[PDB]
Enzyme design. Structure first.
Site, PDB file in Angstrom:
ATOM      1  N   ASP A 114       0.811  -1.190   0.000  1.00 41.66           N
ATOM      2  CA  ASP A 114       0.000   0.000   0.000  1.00 41.66           C
ATOM      3  C   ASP A 114       0.859   1.260   0.000  1.00 41.66           C
ATOM      4  N   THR A 136      -6.847   3.874  -1.811  1.00 43.73           N
ATOM      5  CA  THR A 136      -6.654   2.430  -1.678  1.00 43.73           C
ATOM      6  C   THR A 136      -7.764   1.529  -2.238  1.00 43.73           C
ATOM      7  N   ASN A 151     -12.794   5.510  -1.139  1.00 45.74           N
ATOM      8  CA  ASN A 151     -12.720   4.815   0.149  1.00 45.74           C
ATOM      9  C   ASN A 151     -13.991   5.067   0.973  1.00 45.74           C
ATOM     10  N   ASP A 180       2.360   2.807   3.316  1.00 46.13           N
ATOM     11  CA  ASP A 180       1.318   3.835   3.352  1.00 46.13           C
ATOM     12  C   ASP A 180       1.247   4.531   4.702  1.00 46.13           C
ATOM     13  N   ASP A 212      -0.658   0.178  -4.906  1.00 41.35           N
ATOM     14  CA  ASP A 212      -1.982   0.675  -5.285  1.00 41.35           C
ATOM     15  C   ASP A 212      -1.965   2.152  -5.692  1.00 41.35           C
ATOM     16  N   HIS A 228      -2.428  11.160  -0.515  1.00 43.41           N
ATOM     17  CA  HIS A 228      -2.561  10.738  -1.897  1.00 43.41           C
ATOM     18  C   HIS A 228      -4.047  10.813  -2.231  1.00 43.41           C
ATOM     19  N   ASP A 245     -20.704  12.476 -26.361  1.00 47.09           N
ATOM     20  CA  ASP A 245     -20.874  11.693 -25.143  1.00 47.09           C
ATOM     21  C   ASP A 245     -21.737  12.421 -24.116  1.00 47.09           C
ATOM     22  N   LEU A 273     -18.537   6.295 -23.833  1.00 46.75           N
ATOM     23  CA  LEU A 273     -18.806   5.520 -25.038  1.00 46.75           C
ATOM     24  C   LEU A 273     -19.535   6.355 -26.088  1.00 46.75           C
ATOM     25  N   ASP A 295     -22.006   7.941 -28.347  1.00 46.15           N
ATOM     26  CA  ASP A 295     -23.461   8.059 -28.240  1.00 46.15           C
ATOM     27  C   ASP A 295     -24.174   7.489 -29.489  1.00 46.15           C
TER      28      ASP A 295
HETATM   29  C1  LIG Z   1     -15.179  -0.655 -19.042  1.00 42.62           C
HETATM   30  O1  LIG Z   1     -15.519  -2.030 -19.144  1.00 42.62           O
HETATM   31  C2  LIG Z   1     -16.819  -2.314 -18.666  1.00 42.62           C
HETATM   32  C3  LIG Z   1     -17.024  -3.827 -18.659  1.00 42.62           C
HETATM   33  O2  LIG Z   1     -16.975  -4.348 -19.971  1.00 42.62           O
HETATM   34  C4  LIG Z   1     -17.875  -1.567 -19.483  1.00 42.62           C
HETATM   35  O3  LIG Z   1     -19.036  -1.555 -18.704  1.00 42.62           O
HETATM   36  C5  LIG Z   1     -20.135  -2.234 -19.329  1.00 42.62           C
HETATM   37  O4  LIG Z   1     -20.824  -1.419 -20.240  1.00 42.62           O
HETATM   38  C6  LIG Z   1     -21.842  -2.127 -20.914  1.00 42.62           C
HETATM   39  C7  LIG Z   1     -22.439  -1.224 -21.985  1.00 42.62           C
HETATM   40  O5  LIG Z   1     -23.098  -0.139 -21.368  1.00 42.62           O
HETATM   41  C8  LIG Z   1     -22.918  -2.596 -19.941  1.00 42.62           C
HETATM   42  O6  LIG Z   1     -23.824  -3.394 -20.673  1.00 42.62           O
HETATM   43  C9  LIG Z   1     -25.182  -3.190 -20.228  1.00 42.62           C
HETATM   44  O7  LIG Z   1     -25.553  -4.140 -19.255  1.00 42.62           O
HETATM   45  C10 LIG Z   1     -26.821  -3.892 -18.687  1.00 42.62           C
HETATM   46  C11 LIG Z   1     -27.039  -4.793 -17.472  1.00 42.62           C
HETATM   47  O8  LIG Z   1     -25.825  -5.392 -17.072  1.00 42.62           O
HETATM   48  C12 LIG Z   1     -25.955  -5.969 -15.750  1.00 42.62           C
HETATM   49  O9  LIG Z   1     -25.352  -7.247 -15.700  1.00 42.62           O
HETATM   50  C13 LIG Z   1     -23.964  -7.196 -15.983  1.00 42.62           C
HETATM   51  C14 LIG Z   1     -23.368  -8.597 -16.156  1.00 42.62           C
HETATM   52  O10 LIG Z   1     -23.559  -9.414 -15.016  1.00 42.62           O
HETATM   53  C15 LIG Z   1     -23.244  -6.415 -14.883  1.00 42.62           C
HETATM   54  O11 LIG Z   1     -21.873  -6.329 -15.202  1.00 42.62           O
HETATM   55  C16 LIG Z   1     -23.827  -5.011 -14.729  1.00 42.62           C
HETATM   56  O12 LIG Z   1     -23.259  -4.424 -13.567  1.00 42.62           O
HETATM   57  C17 LIG Z   1     -23.486  -3.000 -13.497  1.00 42.62           C
HETATM   58  O13 LIG Z   1     -24.615  -2.678 -12.705  1.00 42.62           O
HETATM   59  C18 LIG Z   1     -24.541  -3.187 -11.385  1.00 42.62           C
HETATM   60  C19 LIG Z   1     -25.807  -2.805 -10.622  1.00 42.62           C
HETATM   61  O14 LIG Z   1     -25.971  -1.400 -10.625  1.00 42.62           O
HETATM   62  C20 LIG Z   1     -23.311  -2.660 -10.648  1.00 42.62           C
HETATM   63  O15 LIG Z   1     -23.174  -3.342  -9.416  1.00 42.62           O
HETATM   64  C21 LIG Z   1     -22.041  -2.836 -11.476  1.00 42.62           C
HETATM   65  O16 LIG Z   1     -20.991  -2.134 -10.847  1.00 42.62           O
HETATM   66  C22 LIG Z   1     -22.272  -2.294 -12.882  1.00 42.62           C
HETATM   67  O17 LIG Z   1     -22.492  -0.898 -12.805  1.00 42.62           O
HETATM   68  C23 LIG Z   1     -21.861  -0.213 -13.903  1.00 42.62           C
HETATM   69  O18 LIG Z   1     -22.561  -0.352 -15.130  1.00 42.62           O
HETATM   70  C24 LIG Z   1     -23.874   0.178 -15.095  1.00 42.62           C
HETATM   71  C25 LIG Z   1     -24.576  -0.082 -16.428  1.00 42.62           C
HETATM   72  O19 LIG Z   1     -24.853  -1.462 -16.547  1.00 42.62           O
HETATM   73  C26 LIG Z   1     -23.839   1.671 -14.759  1.00 42.62           C
HETATM   74  O20 LIG Z   1     -25.156   2.164 -14.689  1.00 42.62           O
HETATM   75  C27 LIG Z   1     -23.117   1.881 -13.426  1.00 42.62           C
HETATM   76  O21 LIG Z   1     -23.008   3.258 -13.124  1.00 42.62           O
HETATM   77  C28 LIG Z   1     -21.732   1.264 -13.539  1.00 42.62           C
HETATM   78  O22 LIG Z   1     -21.032   1.953 -14.542  1.00 42.62           O
HETATM   79  C29 LIG Z   1     -25.357  -5.077 -14.647  1.00 42.62           C
HETATM   80  O23 LIG Z   1     -25.730  -5.561 -13.370  1.00 42.62           O
HETATM   81  C30 LIG Z   1     -27.869  -4.158 -19.774  1.00 42.62           C
HETATM   82  O24 LIG Z   1     -29.172  -3.861 -19.310  1.00 42.62           O
HETATM   83  C31 LIG Z   1     -27.596  -3.273 -20.987  1.00 42.62           C
HETATM   84  O25 LIG Z   1     -28.435  -3.636 -22.065  1.00 42.62           O
HETATM   85  C32 LIG Z   1     -28.344  -2.626 -23.088  1.00 42.62           C
HETATM   86  O26 LIG Z   1     -28.250  -3.105 -24.408  1.00 42.62           O
HETATM   87  C33 LIG Z   1     -29.411  -3.740 -24.875  1.00 42.62           C
HETATM   88  C34 LIG Z   1     -29.132  -4.347 -26.247  1.00 42.62           C
HETATM   89  O27 LIG Z   1     -30.004  -5.430 -26.472  1.00 42.62           O
HETATM   90  C35 LIG Z   1     -30.547  -2.722 -24.924  1.00 42.62           C
HETATM   91  O28 LIG Z   1     -31.721  -3.313 -25.434  1.00 42.62           O
HETATM   92  C36 LIG Z   1     -30.805  -2.164 -23.525  1.00 42.62           C
HETATM   93  O29 LIG Z   1     -31.772  -1.130 -23.596  1.00 42.62           O
HETATM   94  C37 LIG Z   1     -29.488  -1.621 -22.964  1.00 42.62           C
HETATM   95  O30 LIG Z   1     -29.152  -0.428 -23.653  1.00 42.62           O
HETATM   96  C38 LIG Z   1     -26.130  -3.325 -21.417  1.00 42.62           C
HETATM   97  O31 LIG Z   1     -25.884  -4.554 -22.063  1.00 42.62           O
HETATM   98  C39 LIG Z   1     -22.322  -3.395 -18.778  1.00 42.62           C
HETATM   99  O32 LIG Z   1     -23.275  -3.555 -17.743  1.00 42.62           O
HETATM  100  C40 LIG Z   1     -21.067  -2.717 -18.217  1.00 42.62           C
HETATM  101  N1  LIG Z   1     -20.324  -3.595 -17.326  1.00 42.62           N
HETATM  102  C41 LIG Z   1     -19.895  -3.176 -16.133  1.00 42.62           C
HETATM  103  C42 LIG Z   1     -19.413  -4.214 -15.155  1.00 42.62           C
HETATM  104  O33 LIG Z   1     -19.880  -1.989 -15.816  1.00 42.62           O
HETATM  105  C43 LIG Z   1     -17.502  -0.096 -19.673  1.00 42.62           C
HETATM  106  O34 LIG Z   1     -18.301   0.500 -20.656  1.00 42.62           O
HETATM  107  C44 LIG Z   1     -16.040   0.102 -20.045  1.00 42.62           C
HETATM  108  N2  LIG Z   1     -15.762   1.528 -20.080  1.00 42.62           N
HETATM  109  C45 LIG Z   1     -15.217   2.130 -21.145  1.00 42.62           C
HETATM  110  C46 LIG Z   1     -15.082   3.627 -21.078  1.00 42.62           C
HETATM  111  O35 LIG Z   1     -14.834   1.525 -22.144  1.00 42.62           O
HETATM  112 CA   LIG Z   2     -22.125   8.004 -24.420  1.00 48.74          CA
HETATM  113 ZN   LIG Z   3      -3.532   2.579  -0.380  1.00 48.25          ZN
HETATM  114 ZN   LIG Z   4      -3.009   6.186   2.423  1.00 43.11          ZN
END
Ligand SMILES: *[C@@H]1O[C@H](CO)[C@@H](O[C@@H]2O[C@H](CO)[C@@H](O[C@@H]3O[C@H](CO[C@H]4O[C@H](CO)[C@@H](O)[C@H](O[C@H]5O[C@H](CO)[C@@H](O)[C@H](O)[C@@H]5O[C@H]5O[C@H](CO)[C@@H](O)[C@H](O)[C@@H]5O)[C@@H]4O)[C@@H](O)[C@H](O[C@H]4O[C@H](CO)[C@@H](O)[C@H](O)[C@@H]4O)[C@@H]3O)[C@H](O)[C@H]2NC(C)=O)[C@H](O)[C@H]1NC(C)=O
Ligand SMILES: [Ca+2]
Ligand SMILES: [Zn+2]
Ligand SMILES: [Zn+2]
Ligand SMILES: O=C1N=C(N2CCN(Cc3ccccc3B(O)O)CC2)S/C1=C\c1ccc(Cl)c(Cl)c1
Ligand SMILES: *[C@@H]1O[C@H](CO)[C@@H](O[C@@H]2O[C@H](CO)[C@@H](O)[C@H](O)[C@H]2NC(C)=O)[C@H](O)[C@H]1NC(C)=O
Ligand SMILES: *[C@@H]1O[C@H](CO)[C@@H](O[C@@H]2O[C@H](CO)[C@@H](O)[C@H](O)[C@H]2NC(C)=O)[C@H](O)[C@H]1NC(C)=O
Ligand SMILES: [K+]
Ligand code: NA
Length: 779
Positions: free
Chosen positions: A121, A159, A180, A261, A308, A414, A659, A665, A667
């Site tokens: 850390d 962290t 955190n 740390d 970290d 940090h 965006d 991502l 739009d």
């Molecule tokens: C970095 O890399 C990550 C991982 O690849 C990318 O994040 C992904 O982005 C895609 C595209 O938007 C998301 O796909 C959509 O998924 C939702 C439902 O997904 C659920 O199940 C999956 C799989 O088990 C989980 O991973 C998701 O988890 C999210 O939500 C939970 C609960 O809130 C949370 O605990 C997690 O931390 C995570 O939150 C993050 O993502 C959500 C959005 O899902 C966001 O709101 C939050 O603030 C966090 O960022 C989740 O439980 C699904 O409904 C969607 O369907 C869409 O497409 C269909 C097409 O048929 C349409 O019809 C429909 O209308 C929707 O538009 C998407 O498939 C994916 O969830 C997400 N994965 C994670 C883990 O975040 C990032 O985009 C990358 N970043 C960059 C900049 O490149």
């Molecule tokens: Ca966007």
């Molecule tokens: Zn730390």
């Molecule tokens: Zn610290």
């Protein structure tokens, strides 16, 4: 309820799932207060310390001792780590000369080389300069294995966000651990470093390495350790686990140290008091390697030594107070320190006035040591907005400073912007899968999850790493990347129209080989676009968004800057190649009293007047606020040439980014929210530029033989220059400062545009992936 009266005999640090009503004996039981009554006495043995002495060699095995020096200890896997040195005349691992491990040298039963992650850390990257004088074991790992000069953490550089990023390959905004401490307005609950809320699984998203391993039938050691378990016991436990029968032995292990740390906060990173904790960590590394050597595993195991985040000099005397700026600070809650997040003290307080708060926080002291940002305005490289736990109002705090709500034990801290030098942390890989005596460029911690998956034979869950960009760290087990397939092929339209066909309100009074050096970008989504060739540039013009998705041109070192003649000041010519229906119109711009327009290829850099006229085409035009235009014109007119002169030519690719929902991502049309007044010309949220040249600067950009050199930017398209406190002055006084803050990876731009770059080059695709993840930090 937990039946504590159960026993931990034959169960110490067991790996099997055990839950209520049953009592536990795992490294996390203390944290759940669910340990058996005899966990401490049976599992946390401390008697006689952690080291063998000559007066203990060949003793009778006493079970009361922390570790053993008896004859049988070796096969039983619980000797003190220095047993063979003290009792059998062996050398410490650190005193042995390095030898290349060309292949795993593992005992029979070992199918794959195990992976051990050794995380420290707050280990600032520059601490490594203290060498073998201070950290001989770590220095051996670093010099003999594969090391980076530093590793970039994620923002915030704290962290929890960083450890979970390491485990998942995800940005905090994606995995959910955005600080955190954090407040989730949907849970209406608060997560803290200390306390029990964090144990609720509802906070933790994505899929961490241990889950990925488990779900693919690979056994993981328990990554987490209850803080009361001494480091020497964590080490012995790992060593014991590695001594387990073939059918129980885990393949991946993690050790964690809270140092340096703690000492960093107390004394600051340049304190002489830092030497002692660094010595202690090295000693622990030494115990691990001595232990592996005793087990005949020191040329079998892959070890990752990883931090970290770093540590900066921060003292009480450098604290900004919001009460100096705002009248009623008792009505807001501030997540304070090396970053700021602000929300009303009472959730959803209707009197909360964020525009007014931001206004009082904007450029109010000339030496102001923080800057307020709506989260969508934060530099895109930080990837810190797309989560409900991230407050709309943010403060980026200047390095070495703190921000507090209102009015010294600590000298270090940090949390700052992750491009800050003092926040960089360490990476070393040592073992059969890593290269021998190899230095690699710095890289981001989001990349590591993919590599650890490669190291363990796993298929990574979806993440933000770019799989392949770190292949150059590995002897084998590399990942063969495959180029993504183009989704939309481009139209190549010739002339089909005449100037007489256009009612737009506009009034004017061998391209590829030279302007598209690395192939055209592939469009990776369903859309319709036209390739347009010009003498000085090429472009992929979208018939849907009414502007190029990319404009590509090359500027030689000797190329000449010219002016825009007075009569051409407001010149826009229609494009006979493109339908009037698929064009912008100058009337919208005349009507929109706030929005102006700009050109992607700069008229200032055309070769000849007959070429200048190409630049003024309606298909090179983009909507730009006058505020932004100050930035863009200076970029187009002064900076591109300065880049061309310093780098022996540059190839440039610029374009719009949409965006509006700040998810990082591209739009879809439905998500775009702003259009030029009375039209359907969509307004970009950002404009990017990707500037490429030859790494060997002695060769011009257009005739480069070898590796490329890149820097990029994603500039916020905003209606004012509030972000730049010195914007009232000449652009030479502030524009570059702004651009540096919004530096970016090509990969960032790819996410935001749906384009794929550098498809035609003489380089390996793996080398190209490395290029796309590079960030020019200006530090
Ligand atoms: C970095 O890399 C990550 C991982 O690849 C990318 O994040 C992904 O982005 C895609 C595209 O938007 C998301 O796909 C959509 O998924 C939702 C439902 O997904 C659920 O199940 C999956 C799989 O088990 C989980 O991973 C998701 O988890 C999210 O939500 C939970 C609960 O809130 C949370 O605990 C997690 O931390 C995570 O939150 C993050 O993502 C959500 C959005 O899902 C966001 O709101 C939050 O603030 C966090 O960022 C989740 O439980 C699904 O409904 C969607 O369907 C869409 O497409 C269909 C097409 O048929 C349409 O019809 C429909 O209308 C929707 O538009 C998407 O498939 C994916 O969830 C997400 N994965 C994670 C883990 O975040 C990032 O985009 C990358 N970043 C960059 C900049 O490149
Ligand atoms: Ca966007
Ligand atoms: Zn730390
Ligand atoms: Zn610290
Ligand atoms: O044993 C551990 N203790 C951790 N802490 C951070 C959080 N605190 C805060 C106080 C306690 C201690 S993390 C941890 C193990 C760990 C967690 C994640 C990862 Cl990626 C790795 Cl390599 C190791
Ligand atoms: C909690 O733990 C104790 C010890 O393991 C359990 O005590 C045992 O109970 C069984 C069945 O009643 C007896 O036959 C044994 O003699 C007990 N063992 C010992 C060594 O005490 C007890 O059952 C548990 N309490 C529960 C289940 O609520
Ligand atoms: C922003 O700052 C101004 C002062 O610069 C604050 O206004 C002062 O405080 C109260 C409430 O408005 C007035 O009685 C004083 O007359 C003001 N002082 C001055 C020098 O004008 C204002 O409250 C601040 N806004 C916020 C939201 O904190
Ligand atoms: K206008
Ligand atoms: Na300004």
């Amino acid at each position: 309820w937990t039946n504590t009266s159960g026993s931990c005999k034959g169960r110490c640090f067991e790996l099997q799932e055990v839950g209520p009503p049953d009592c536990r004996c795992d490294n996390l039981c203390k944290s759940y207060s669910s340990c058996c009554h005899d966990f401490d006495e049976l599992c946390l043995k401390t008697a006689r310390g952690w080291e063998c002495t000559k007066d203990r060699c060949g003793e009778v095995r006493n079970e009361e001792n922390a570790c053993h020096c008896s004859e049988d200890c070796l096969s039983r896997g619980d000797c003190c780590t220095n047993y063979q040195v003290v009792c059998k005349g062996e050398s410490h691992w650190v005193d042995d000369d390095c030898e290349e491990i060309r292949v795993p040298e593992c005992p029979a039963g070992f199918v794959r080389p195990p992976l051990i992650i050794f995380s420290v850390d707050g280990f600032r990257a520059s601490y490594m300069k203290k060498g073998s004088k201070v950290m001989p074991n770590i220095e051996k790992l670093r010099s003999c294995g594969t090391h980076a000069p530093y590793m970039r953490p994620v923002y915030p550089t704290k962290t929890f966000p960083n450890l979970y990023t390491l485990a998942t390959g995800l940005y905090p905004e994606s995995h959910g651990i955005v600080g955190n401490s954090m407040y989730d307005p949907v849970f209406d609950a608060t997560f803290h470093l200390r306390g029990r809320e964090k144990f609720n699984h509802r906070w933790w998203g994505g899929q961490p390495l241990w889950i990925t391993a488990t779900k693919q039938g690979v056994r993981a050691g328990t990554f987490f350790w209850s803080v009361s378990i001494p480091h020497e016991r964590r080490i012995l436990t790992i060593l014991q686990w590695l001594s387990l029968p073939d059918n129980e032995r885990p393949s991946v292990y993690a050790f964690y140290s809270e140092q340096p740390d703690f000492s960093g906060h107390k004394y600051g990173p340049f304190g002489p008091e830092m030497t002692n904790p660094l010595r202690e960590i090295d000693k622990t590394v030494g115990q691990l390697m001595d232990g592996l050597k005793q087990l005949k595993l020191h040329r079998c195991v892959n070890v990752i030594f990883v931090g970290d985040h770093g540590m900066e000099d921060v003292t009480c005397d450098r604290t900004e107070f919001l009460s100096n700026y705002l009248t009623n600070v008792d009505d807001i809650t501030l997540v304070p320190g090396t970053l700021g997040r602000i929300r009303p003290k009472i959730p959803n307080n209707l009197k909360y006035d964020p525009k007014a708060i931001i206004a009082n926080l904007t450029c109010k002291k000339p030496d102001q040591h923080f800057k307020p940002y709506m989260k969508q305005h934060l530099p895109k490289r930080l990837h810190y907005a797309n989560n409900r736990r991230i407050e709309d109002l943010h403060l980026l705090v200047e390095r070495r400073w703190h921000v507090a709500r209102k009015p010294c034990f600590f000298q270090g801290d940090h949390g700052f912007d992750n491009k800050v030098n003092s926040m960089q942390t360490v990476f070393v890989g040592y073992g059969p899968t890593f290269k021998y005596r190899t230095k690699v460029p710095p890289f981001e911690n989001i990349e590591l999850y993919n590599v650890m998956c490669d190291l363990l034979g796993l298929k990574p869950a979806p993440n933000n790493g770019t799989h392949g960009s770190l292949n150059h760290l590995l002897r084998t087990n590399t990942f063969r990347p495959t180029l993504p397939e183009e989704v939309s092929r481009p139209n190549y339209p010739g002339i089909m129209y005449l100037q007489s066909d256009f009612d737009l309100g506009c009034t004017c009074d061998s391209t590829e080989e030279r302007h598209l050096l690395y192939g055209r970008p592939a469009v990776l989504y369903r859309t319709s676009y036209d390739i347009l060739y010009h003498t000085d540039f090429e472009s992929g013009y979208s018939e849907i968004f009414l502007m190029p998705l990319w404009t590509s041109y090359t500027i030689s070192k000797q190329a000449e800057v010219s002016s825009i003649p007075e009569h051409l000041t407001n010149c826009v010519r229609p494009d006979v190649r493109v339908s009037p229906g698929f064009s912008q119109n100058c009337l919208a711009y005349k009507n929109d009293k706030q929005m102006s327009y700009g050109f992607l290829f700069p008229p200032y850099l055309s070769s000849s007047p007959e070429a200048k006229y190409d630049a003024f085409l309606v298909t090179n035009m983009v909507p730009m606020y006058p505020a932004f235009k100050r930035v863009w014109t200076y970029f187009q007119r002064v900076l591109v040439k300065k880049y061309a002169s310093e780098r022996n030519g540059v190839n440039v690719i610029s374009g719009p980014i949409f965006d509006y929902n700040y998810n990082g991502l591209r739009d879809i049309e439905d998500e775009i929210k702003q259009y030029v007044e009375g039209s359907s010309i969509p307004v970009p949220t950002h404009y990017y530029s990707i500037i490429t040249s030859c790494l060997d600067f002695t060769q011009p950009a257009d005739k480069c033989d070898g590796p490329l050199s890149v820097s990029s930017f994603i500039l916020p398209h905003r209606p004012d220059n509030d972000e730049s406190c010195n914007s009232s002055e000449d652009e030479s006084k502030w524009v570059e400062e702004l651009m540096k803050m919004h530096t970016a990876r090509v990969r960032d731009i790819e996410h935001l545009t749906g384009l794929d770059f550098y498809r035609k080059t003489s380089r390996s695709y793996s080398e190209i992936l490395t290029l796309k993840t590079y960030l020019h930090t200006y530090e």
